[PDB]
């Protein structure tokens, strides 16, 4: 009768041990699952807000330079880029090439936060330009970061709504050009030649991507960006490969996958060709310069010896190589696994809802302009705010109904103000952070809970089989 | 002593087999769970972008027709729709009725992509009108689809940002009407009588729903639509009932649940009443015509015999029946299970973030207009771009500061351009696709992992019970 006993015991043992092997195999493939939960009690970290002027250059500083005699380089540069033929003519008829081939003048022409940010107010407390760290970005020359993680440790929202949040009255400084001057529309550029502010609401301590990640905002409108905070926490080894590292770039940035991809693209570009792209994050590696830098362009323009014929092609080898490598990188994602890099173990993103409204009312424009002057403008009678304030002040102090002229003055003041000024509120709609946490699909505690009951008896029965077998 | 043995063995067997029955029952109800994970390496399929002009008709072609003598039908149609009384007077005082009762003239009046799309640029490469497939939609007459899945197989984004994405400089062709003519505001229409472009960013190869799924975009603003790709993969039988089929409509569309619901609504409407709705997708079934077609409206207007009194009611039975069936379908979702149809096993959706900015700067308007002419307009001196370009060119070539007149010319050029022109960028913010995959809640491998350990021993003990019982 023991034959049936042995056969059924063997069959049961094989079944149980195959089941246990299947379980330990399921654990061996370290699967993960993303669990989303709304945490309404965890403190919300206010993001980092990078504001850029969509128009990089300022026509006011340009006009000032022509009225003086320090614009010669620019006057040379234009005279150079418009006399010789260049490949990618659209690139060096643009402003990025102007930045690359002469950087100091580009800085001297770019916008300043003083002139740009006219009023700032965070968490019901006044903030100044001292809360914004400046940085540079080609085609978005000057970009200023509030809550950049450098001046102060970090900023937190304990309150929702646009009242408890960043509020920026910004003048885009859209100034009328020189009397006989018009800019060149770079048609290979999908983001520039627009009036407004490019805002990047990104994770605190992470480098901004004004081109890729920014959203633009128009003048003459109060635009409110309500944010919902998403916290994506990942698993390190062995379940995943995220690390709590920090990107290098120019300055230590909190790690984000896209920013690291941009940095490794810049490094690959630096390796393949001996130049660097102003589209990608800066790296400041000696002696690497910008791609599309004609080193002797001043000498070429200065036709000291007549080997440079009119409308002659200029090589620009580095620019072509950069274009080739950028095309290969943009049309193929295989590089993403070479420079590797990893997702941040903890990442913070934001769902932004942008809603705009007509701002400011013609009723409050005079009271606005009064304070904007009283705080920021002691000079420059030839300014929009001043011409607008003259109209509004003669309306409010004539010394019934608005006359046609009175109406014309009010309308001209409103057009000036709303062509130049915009309010931008950035706030948390709710303090409930939506957390996507990566969890082990088959935890080790789960393995123990699913094997121990079998294993405790079946190791003993294996010992029984041993004793019955060879003794 | 064996009585206690038998009783405890029986109790344990009943418990174990009830547990196994509970598990196999849990498997019998083929539950599913949606698991969301962010895949940062899978290739992202660029969507299909359908641009429509919010104003279906073009006042320019209308004026041209009146200056010629081929507008008679229209001149008759108006003279007809405004002389006789009709139920739903708002419907046939609209443009959809004009399309339905005389289609060819509606096509001749509708917008052309040439005139509409002024500059296109996808993935840093120039694109023309040859990349857009035309299609028709009542109240959105001409709708042009980029990446429609017909001209080429499919399009992929390997790069983020507005630079590597679709960029469309579109002129809405908002032309001033005839000197003594005004349109009729159809107040039963919540979407028309607006200036802009209706954009549908929908799954590639899926029919566009400009009314239901489109979002509108204003002229004079560069609007950037950043897309985040969501891939929802479902389970076929036995867990679900999705299929990888294709809708028919006019042309083979990739299956989406809403589009199939619209098609089955159109089929139900074709069955219940012998007509068809221009609001719903077209089907082109002979000999079915549009609801709200008065077949002899030309004969009715031509008062050859005076049985048609002034302001007399006209029956329009088919229009009333279509209104009845549409009301019943819109106020009751029970039809959704009759025409059945299923969710696509694999569906692609997009979270779009639209941010607008003032475009173009007055600095770059002349350089823009120059190229728009040099590429697209050899004729029509009586055009906005031409009058605007005259102003800008006399500003830039007068042959200091802008004079009042100079300022007036600049302002009038800017108003014309920004009333007619708009830039639209559509791009992927990130290439990380958020994939919601439907997974078996209780997989068969899980059933085996949860039963085998018990089953291996307990079938053997059942054999023991057999042997002890009847032998």
């Amino acid at each position: 009768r023991k034959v049936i006993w042995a056969l059924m015991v063997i069959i049961g043992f094989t079944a149980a041990t195959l089941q246990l092997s299947l379980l330990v195999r399921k654990y061996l493939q370290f699967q993960v699952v993303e669990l989303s939960e709304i945490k309404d009690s965890m403190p919300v970290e206010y993001p980092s807000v990078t504001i850029c002027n969509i128009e990089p250059i300022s026509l006011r500083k340009i006009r000032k330079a022509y009225n003086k005699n320090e614009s010669q380089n620019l006057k040379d540069w234009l005279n150079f880029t418009q006399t010789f033929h260049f490949k990618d003519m659209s690139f060096m008829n643009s402003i990025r090439a102007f930045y690359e081939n002469l950087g100091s003048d580009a800085k001297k022409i770019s916008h300043d936060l003083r002139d740009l940010l006219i009023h700032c107010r965070f968490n019901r407390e006044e903030c100044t330009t001292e809360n914004f760290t400046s940085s540079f970005d080609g085609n978005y020359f000057n970009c200023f970061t509030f809550n950049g993680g450098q001046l102060r440790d970090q900023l937190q929202m304990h309150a929702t709504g646009p009242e408890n949040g960043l509020s920026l009255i910004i003048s885009i400084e859209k100034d009328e050009p020189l009397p006989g001057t018009y800019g060149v529309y770079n048609f290979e550029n999908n983001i520039l030649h627009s009036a407004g502010v490019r805002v990047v609401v990104h994770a605190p301590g992470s480098m901004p991507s004004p081109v890729d990640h920014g959203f633009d905002i128009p003048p003459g409108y109060s635009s409110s960006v309500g944010l919902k905070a998403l916290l994506h926490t990942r698993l390190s080894e062995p379940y995943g490969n995220c690390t709590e590292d920090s990107l290098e770039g120019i300055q230590t940035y909190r790690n984000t996958f896209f920013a690291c991809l941009q940095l490794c693209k810049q490094r690959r570009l630096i390796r393949e060709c001996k130049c660097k792209s102003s589209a990608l994050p800066d790296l400041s590696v000696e002696n690497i310069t910008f791609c599309g830098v004609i080193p002797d362009w001043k000498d070429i323009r200065r036709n000291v010896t007549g080997e440079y014929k009119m409308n002659q092609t200029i090589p620009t080898i580095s620019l072509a190589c950069e274009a080739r490598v950028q095309k290969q990188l943009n049309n193929d994602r295989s590089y993403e696994t070479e420079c590797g890099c990893y997702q941040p173990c903890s990442e913070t993103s934001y769902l932004k809802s942008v809603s705009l409204s007509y701002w400011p009312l013609e009723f409050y424009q005079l009271s606005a302009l009064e304070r904007f002057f009283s705080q920021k403008n002691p000079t420059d009678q030839q300014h929009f705010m001043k011409i607008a304030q003259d109209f509004l002040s003669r309306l409010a102090h004539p010394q019934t109904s608005y006359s046609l002229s009175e109406k014309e003055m009010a309308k001209e003041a409103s057009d000036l103000i709303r062509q130049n000024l915009l309010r931008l509120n950035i706030y948390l709609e709710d303090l409930s952070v939506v957390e996507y946490r990566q969890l082990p699909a088959y935890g080790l505690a789960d393995l123990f809970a699913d094997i121990g009951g079998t294993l405790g008896l079946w190791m003993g029965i294996s010992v029984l089989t041993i004793m019955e077998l060879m003794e | 002593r064996k009585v206690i043995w038998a009783l405890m063995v029986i109790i344990g067997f009943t418990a174990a087999t009830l547990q196994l029955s509970l598990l196999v029952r849990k498997y019998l109800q083929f539950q599913v769970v949606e698991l969301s994970e962010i895949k940062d390496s899978m290739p992202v399929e660029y969507p299909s972008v359908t641009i429509c002009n919010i104003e279906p008709i073009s006042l320019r072609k209308i004026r041209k027709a009146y200056n010629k003598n081929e507008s008679q039908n229209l001149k008759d149609w108006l003279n007809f729709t405004q002389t006789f009384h009709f139920k739903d007077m708002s419907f046939m005082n609209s443009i959809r009725a004009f399309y339905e009762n005389l289609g060819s003239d509606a096509k001749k009046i509708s917008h052309d992509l040439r005139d509409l799309l002024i500059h296109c640029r996808f993935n840093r490469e120039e694109c023309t009108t040859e990349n857009f497939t035309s299609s028709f939609d009542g109240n959105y007459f001409n709708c042009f689809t980029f990446n429609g899945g017909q001209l080429r197989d499919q399009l992929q984004m390997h790069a983020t940002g507005p630079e590597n994405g679709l960029s469309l400089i579109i002129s809405i062709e908002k032309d001033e009407p005839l000197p003594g003519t005004y349109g009729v505001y159809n107040f039963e229409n919540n979407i028309l009588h607006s200036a802009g472009v209706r954009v549908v960013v929908h799954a590639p190869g899926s029919m566009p729903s400009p009314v239901d799924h489109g979002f509108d975009i204003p002229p004079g603003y560069s609007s950037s639509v950043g897309l985040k790709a969501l891939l929802h993969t479902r389970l076929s039988e036995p867990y679900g009932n999705c299929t990888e089929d294709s809708l028919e409509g006019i042309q083979t569309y990739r299956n989406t649940f809403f589009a199939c619901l619209q098609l089955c609504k159109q089929r139900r409407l074709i069955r219940e009443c012998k007509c068809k709705s221009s609001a719903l997708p077209d089907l082109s079934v002979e000999n079915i015509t549009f609801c709200g077609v008065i077949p002899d409206w030309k004969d009715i207007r031509r008062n050859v015999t005076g049985e048609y009194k002034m302001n007399q009611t006209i029956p329009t039975i088919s229009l009333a029946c279509e209104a009845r069936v549409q009301k019943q379908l819109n106020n009751d979702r029970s039809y959704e299970t009759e025409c059945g149809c299923y969710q696509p096993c694999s569906e692609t959706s997009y979270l779009k973030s639209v941010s607008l900015s003032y475009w173009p700067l007055e600095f770059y308007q002349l350089s823009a207009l120059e190229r728009f002419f040099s590429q697209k307009n050899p004729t029509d001196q009586q055009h906005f771009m031409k009058i605007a370009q005259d102003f800008l060119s006399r500003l830039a070539h007068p042959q200091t500061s802008y004079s009042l007149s100079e300022k007036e010319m600049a302002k009038e050029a800017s108003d014309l351009i920004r009333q007619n022109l708009l830039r639209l960028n559509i791009y992927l913010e990130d290439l990380s696709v958020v994939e919601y995959r439907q997974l078996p809640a209780y997989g068969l491998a899980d059933l085996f992992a949860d039963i085998g350990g018990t089953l291996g021993l307990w079938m053997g003990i059942s054999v023991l019970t057999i042997m002890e019982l009847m032998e």
Partner: peptide, 4 residues
């Protein structure tokens, strides 16, 4: 980047 700007003509006259």
């Amino acid at each position: 980047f700007m003509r006259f």
